[PDB]
Design a protein around this ligand. Structure first.
Ligand code: HEM
Ligand code: HEM
Lengths: 137, 137
């Protein structure tokens, strides 16, 4: 289930983080404009960049903490507030998060690993609701 | 064959019981709703909870008794009736049991351990028929 999926991702986090982030950027290539130095690169070029794995792991490290602090896939309001107020997220709207979760759920459904993809879809919807409650446009 | 599989499973009943029950919940995550104390718990947290190990072993012990009393994977009607009339099963339907046997057979086919997975599938089919005959919806 969802709780065990957090443990599965944490046991191979850099690989899952990069693979899910690449699935996101490949499904929604214009989302590269929120980043720097990602356009014009294949997946293997991105994975050999100095910062790509490190930044994407830091993302997913915090995402798994937000998932782990949730109750029944409902995140803490304090975690949502942090994600709204982060300077790095000042250009974002809830739509950016909705696209991330579409891509993450599609990746889980296609994976050989037995993820509870429906719970991840609910967690993303509840996270988006919490971002809106915390004032993200 | 099927009789050796009962001996394999019995030899390490707690481990097989827990592994097959978690394979069931992983393939059909919605089924966790019938186990309210397992919601939101990692697999290692479940294995720390006395009743997870105890109840799951006792489930599979009874399954192995029913399997052993069967003739050519046809279970006794009396055994199907015990399962229908258990108060812990009062809100189940035959589809719950069908899903358990799909997951069990998948687990056996994926395992390194030899199993007569076709016999477990047919046992499950014949048990579901018997549960329906005994009045399960
Ligand atoms: C639940 C989802 C998310 C979490 C937990 C999260 C977390 C983080 C964290 C921890 C950082 C700091 C990375 C570092 O400095 O090394 C970061 C940076 C950033 N995040 Fe998010 N983020 C999420 C979703 C998003 C989404 C959906 C976007 C845009 C589509 C985005 C865009 C950015 C950008 C542009 C940065 C800074 C640039 C970069 O690290 O390359 N984030 N995020
Ligand atoms: C052939 C299949 C099955 C057998 C042999 C079986 C057997 C048992 C046994 C013996 C118990 C009592 C545990 C104890 O004394 O500690 C039990 C409880 C229970 N069973 Fe079943 N069961 C079967 C299938 C299922 C299925 C498919 C479900 C739900 C999807 C289910 C749900 C429950 C629940 C909720 C309880 C009570 C809580 C618990 O003890 O875990 N069982 N079962």
């Amino acid at each position: 289930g969802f709780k065990q999926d957090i443990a599965t991702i944490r046991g191979d986090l850099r690989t899952y983080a990069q693979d899910i982030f690449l699935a996101f950027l490949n499904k929604y290539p214009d989302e590269r404009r929120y980043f720097k130095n990602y356009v014009g690169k294949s997946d293997q070029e991105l994975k050999s960049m100095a910062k790509f794995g490190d930044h994407t792991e830091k993302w997913f490290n915090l995402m798994m903490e937000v998932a782990d602090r949730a109750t029944d896939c409902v995140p803490l309001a304090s975690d949502a507030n942090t994600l709204v107020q982060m300077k790095q997220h000042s250009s974002l709207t809830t739509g950016n998060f909705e696209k991330l979760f579409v891509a993450l759920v599609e990746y889980m459904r296609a994976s050989g690993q037995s993820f509870d993809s429906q719970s991840w879809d609910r967690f993303g919807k509840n996270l988006v609701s919490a971002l809106s409650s915390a004032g993200m446009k």
